[PDB]
Amino acid sequence: FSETFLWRLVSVDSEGQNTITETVPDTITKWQGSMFCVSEKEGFGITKYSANFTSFLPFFVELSLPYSLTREEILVMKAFVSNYLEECIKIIVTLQPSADFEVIPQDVKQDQCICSGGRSSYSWNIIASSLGRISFIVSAETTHIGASCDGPSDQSQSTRKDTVIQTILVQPEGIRKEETSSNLVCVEDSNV
Amino acid sequence: NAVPLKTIQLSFKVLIGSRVLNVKSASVYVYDYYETGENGFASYSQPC
Amino acid sequence: NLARMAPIPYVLEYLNNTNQLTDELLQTAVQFLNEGYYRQLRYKLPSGAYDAFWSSPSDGSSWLSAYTFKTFEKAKKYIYVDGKIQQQTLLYLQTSQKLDNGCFKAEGNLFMRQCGQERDLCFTAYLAIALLESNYSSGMTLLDDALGCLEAAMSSASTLYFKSYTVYVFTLVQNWEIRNTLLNELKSKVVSERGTLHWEREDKLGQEGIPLYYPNYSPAEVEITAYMLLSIAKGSDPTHDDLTYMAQISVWLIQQQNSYGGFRSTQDTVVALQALAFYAQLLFKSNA
Amino acid sequence: DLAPGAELIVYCILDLELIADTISLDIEKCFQNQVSLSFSDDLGPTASNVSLNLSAAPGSLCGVKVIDSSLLLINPYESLSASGVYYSIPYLSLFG
Amino acid sequence: LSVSGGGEDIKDRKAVVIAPLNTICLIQMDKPVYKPGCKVRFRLISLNTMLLPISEKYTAVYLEDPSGSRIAQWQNQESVGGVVQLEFPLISDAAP
Ligand SMILES: *[C@@H]1O[C@H](CO)[C@@H](O)[C@H](O)[C@H]1NC(C)=O
Ligand SMILES: *[C@@H]1O[C@H](CO)[C@@H](O)[C@H](O)[C@H]1NC(C)=O
Ligand SMILES: *[C@@H]1O[C@H](CO)[C@@H](O)[C@H](O)[C@H]1NC(C)=O
Ligand SMILES: *[C@@H]1O[C@H](CO)[C@@H](O)[C@H](O)[C@H]1NC(C)=O
Ligand SMILES: *[C@@H]1O[C@H](CO)[C@@H](O)[C@H](O)[C@H]1NC(C)=O
Ligand SMILES: *[C@@H]1O[C@H](CO)[C@@H](O)[C@H](O)[C@H]1NC(C)=O
């Protein structure tokens, strides 16, 4: 669960039509809202039926990766794409090529006709042929043909874009060794 | 707390997260807290 | 845990004294002070004693309790510290009499593992150091008993580690005879290199190179060297013949500095940083 | 204006006798005030600009709060509930 | 009670107790169950015996760990409108 993203202590003016304007965080949960509302003239009444709010995305893309990797090790990436639309849709997923790390072409390509409450397990072959921090970028085009598969989408959707960054840290095999040599200079208009 | 001359064995289990092939070795580094000079190193390999 | 907390009050005082205190740096330092207080309050036993490894408590630790009492008293200036915590810690120290002859007894057997049979004596010395540095005068029974124990220690206790503690306590208590004679005696046994001076452990038991004694960067020597630097700096009037000694004793200590600040371990990096701060307290260039 | 524990006494005085009967009704908690908390939209994306339209008594200083509901599925005991406030009042129903 | 008049008059005397009143102060501790890495947002409320807001000053409001130590303290906390807003981050250790 996330944090309470609104905590203001606003006051009521005139009859009372106050509008709290806030920004919702990334957590996908419920948003029950309540208050207590004092006034020196009358008192305070806590709300009885709290207000309900929901945040969700029609399209989920998720990557699960280990924290670190060893130099020159073939790792498989698992990209999960989830569809929550009422219509069964198709999806194509692409990986951005880069020179720092090599990506082995798996020669795998299927446009699964995913539907409501469904998820895929697209995978690719990755070699840790680099050093340091490496960024992985996934992409989607969401070519769908909304009405199941045979029925054309027509004017149902235009484009859903979901790209997420991911971080990996590959390190040379072995143990981390360090040697430090601290020096102090006491110079009075002299050069060392 | 301490490691005397007699050998002491420790053991624990580990599950699997993201699968990876051609896994290389790993390191076990043991060292006294107040004296880093008296330290030892050992190798770790996949049982399979 | 008391490695990110012991040196911050000293470095903050040094920066404030040498016209280098900054508002945002002070705020961030207070923030770290609070954070370390938050972790350190976790280890407290209900008896008022402090012991490490809270998941496996073992009848407190008197040395750790004294160190925490030190740190909380010296860090209470900026962040909030519960006074009842300090009061019950001092009460536990009072109840921890255990007077082995004229000497106190240390509780726990995990910290002073290299001083040998002088564990109780070194614990008494460190408790005295804590009481002096805690802005406490010599009017309390604990300090009187500790000074009485340290006074009858000149003949015995032939260890350079405990000599460092006695040097520090006799420097803390303003004296002309005992402190000066002890510093003069210890100054004879100083290892000198090219431009550097320090004190080896003098661990005569097993002086070899093969059976795990070849590591030259022993953390123990840095602590005693920093004690010597601080004690000699805390003099009535360091003469010009002593400034070269300060430079030579500081260059070696600052040589064993890593890329992150921590020199060898938690216990000695604290003393080395505080000694370096006190040494740089006496020297400053306006323009530089 | 009737808190919980509203007790009813109905009595008659005939010619020389007074007879009374009592019960101990419970009333729903209402706090003599009106609040109309509600959002502007029931659904939205994860980075939307949430608008919350609240109305209450005029000239009221009024503190709001929003929380994930999963906590209520763990420990559904909100501090300061519409019964805690009332139960924190001395002598709300006399005894003897 | 005096019923003086042209006809019969009645003089009556009954006994009651007047009792003193205190004021009730409450904690709106949202987020009923906490996890480490969070920020506790207090809310102190001061109320008359009848549910009305009164100005109140606080001097010794503080937390207490399971060990029994005062961790963070506030001094001279005045109620701006009968509501006091307090904030306190919780460390990432946060002994359960
Ligand atoms: C939980 O908190 C947020 C999600 O709102 C995220 O930044 C964090 O990494 C999450 N951690 C875990 C362990 O789920
Ligand atoms: C909001 O959720 C509560 C939870 O019980 C429910 O009682 C209520 O009917 C929902 N809708 C509104 C408008 O409050
Ligand atoms: C430093 O370098 C400058 C050259 O710009 C030279 O003139 C000067 O003598 C050197 N030494 C000092 C102390 O400035
Ligand atoms: C810095 O030193 C001055 C001079 O004594 C003192 O007034 C001030 O309180 C000090 N500041 C801190 C943060 O210790
Ligand atoms: C403690 O510090 C104060 C300065 O605030 C000083 O007056 C006092 O002498 C010191 N020692 C004791 C035992 O209070
Ligand atoms: C507030 O909402 C408006 C319109 O919906 C827009 O500026 C944005 O979504 C929100 N403001 C910010 C700063 O995000």
- Contact present, D42 and A4 (Cβ < 8 Å): no
- Contact present, A137 and A165 (Cβ < 8 Å): yes
Specify the amino acid at residue C178.
I
How far B6 CA lies from chain A's nearest CA (Å)? Answer: 27
Separation CA A93–CA C12 (nearest Å): 55
Question: How many C-beta atoms surround the C-beta of residue C73 within 10 A?
Answer: 20
Chains that touch E (3 or more CB pairs under 8 A): A, C, D
Pair of tokens at residue A184: 């102090």
Q: Which of C250, C238, C271, C255 has its CA nearest to residue C133?
A: C271
Q: What is the DSSP string of A8-19?
A: ---B--TT--EE
Separation CA E40–CA A63 (nearest Å): 32
Instruction: State which residue of chain E sits closest to A9, comparing Cα positions.
Output: E85
Question: How many C-beta atoms surround the C-beta of residue C216 within 10 A?
Answer: 9
Q: Residues of A with CB below 8 A from B24's CB?
A: 70, 73, 173
Residue A27: nearest ligand to its CA?
1
Which residues in chain E precede a discontinuity of more than 2.5 Å between C and N?
Answer: none
| A19/D63 Cβ within 8 A | no
Separation CA D74–CA D77 (nearest Å): 9
DSSP H/E element including B34: none
Query: Crossing angle for the helix pair C119-133 and C160-172, nearest 10 degrees?
Result: 20
Separation CA C116–CA C109 (nearest Å): 11
Q: With helix as H, strand as E and coil as C, how does A88-107 read?
A: CEECCEEECCCCCCCEECCC
Q: What is the DSSP string of A30-47?
A: B-EEEEEEEETTTEE---
Separation CA D51–CA C276 (nearest Å): 57
Residue nearest to atom 14 of ligand 6 (CA): D49
CB burial of residue A158 (10 Å; 0-12, 13-18, 19+) = exposed
Separation CA E25–CA D13 (nearest Å): 44
Identify any residues that bridge with A103 across adjacent strands, giving them in sequence order. A126
Give yes or no for E16 touching D (CB within 8 A): no
Query: Which atom of ligand 5 lies nearest, measured to the CA of C137?
Result: 13
- Contact present, A46 and A34 (Cβ < 8 Å): yes
Question: How many C-beta atoms surround the C-beta of residue A128 within 10 A?
Answer: 22
Expt. technique: cryo-EM
How far D21 CA lies from chain E's nearest CA (Å)? Answer: 21
| Sign of the dihedral defined by the CA atoms of residues A109, A110, A115, A118, in that order | negative
Instruction: State which residue of chain C sits closest to B35, comparing Cα positions.
Output: C219
CB burial of residue C174 (10 Å; 0-12, 13-18, 19+) = exposed
Q: Supply φ then ψ for residue C222, to 5 degrees.
A: -65, -40
Tell me the CA–centroid distance for residue A23 and ligand 6, in Å: 8
Separation CA A55–CA A33 (nearest Å): 14
Burial string for A88-102 (b: 16+ CB within 10 Å, else e) reads bbbbbbeeeeeeebe
Pair of tokens at residue E26: 């409450």
Instruction: State which residue of chain C sits closest to A185, comparing Cα positions.
Output: C251
Separation CA E91–CA E39 (nearest Å): 9
Query: Crossing angle for the helix pair C7-17 and C62-75, nearest 10 degrees?
Result: 30
- Contact present, C68 and C18 (Cβ < 8 Å): no
C193 contacts: CB under 8 Å, gap ≥ 6:
C252
| Residue for token pair 């509302």 | A37
Separation CA D56–CA C221 (nearest Å): 72
CB burial of residue C266 (10 Å; 0-12, 13-18, 19+) = middle
Separation CA E52–CA D85 (nearest Å): 12
Residue nearest to atom 14 of ligand 1 (CA): A1
Cα distances from E53 to residues A21, A34, A132, in angstroms, run 27, 19, 60
Tell me the CA–centroid distance for residue D50 and ligand 6, in Å: 9
Q: Which of C11, D75, C188 has its CA nearest to residue E35?
A: D75
- Contact present, C123 and C148 (Cβ < 8 Å): no
Resolution of this structure in Å: 4.1
3-state secondary structure of D74: coil
Q: What is the DSSP string of E6-50?
A: SS---B------------EEEE---SSS--SS-EEE--EEEE-SS
Separation CA D57–CA A41 (nearest Å): 9
3-state secondary structure of C84: helix
Pair of tokens at residue A6: 């609104």
Tell me the CA–centroid distance for residue C76 and ligand 5, in Å: 14
Q: Which of A37, B35, A132 has its CA nearest to residue D36?
A: A37
Pair of tokens at residue C164: 């460092």
Pair of tokens at residue E3: 């019923």
Tell me the CA–centroid distance for residue C139 and ligand 5, in Å: 12
Do the two chains B and E touch, given a threshold of 8 Å on CB pairs and at least 3 pairs?
Answer: no
Q: Which of C112, C256, C265 to mutate to test the interface with B (most CBs of B within 10 A)?
A: C265
Separation CA C225–CA C218 (nearest Å): 12
Q: What is the DSSP string of C236-269?
A: S---HHHHHHHHHHHHHHHHS--SSS--S-HHHH
Cα distances from A96 to residues A128, A137, E70, in angstroms, run 16, 6, 54
Q: Which of C4, C41, C44, C79 to mutate to test the interface with E (most CBs of E within 10 A)?
A: C41
CA E55 to centroid of chain Cα atoms: 11
Cα angle C272, C277, C278 (rounded to 5 degrees) comes to: 100
Separation CA D70–CA B25 (nearest Å): 43
Residue C22: nearest ligand to its CA?
4
Give yes or no for E31 touching D (CB within 8 A): yes
Name the E residues in 16-75 with CB < 8 Å from any C CB.
65, 67-73
| Residue for token pair 């949202």 | E30
- Contact present, C280 and C14 (Cβ < 8 Å): yes
Specify the amino acid at residue A57.
L
Give yes or no for C44 touching E (CB within 8 A): yes
Q: Which of C56, C39, C37, C59 has its CA nearest to residue C47?
A: C59
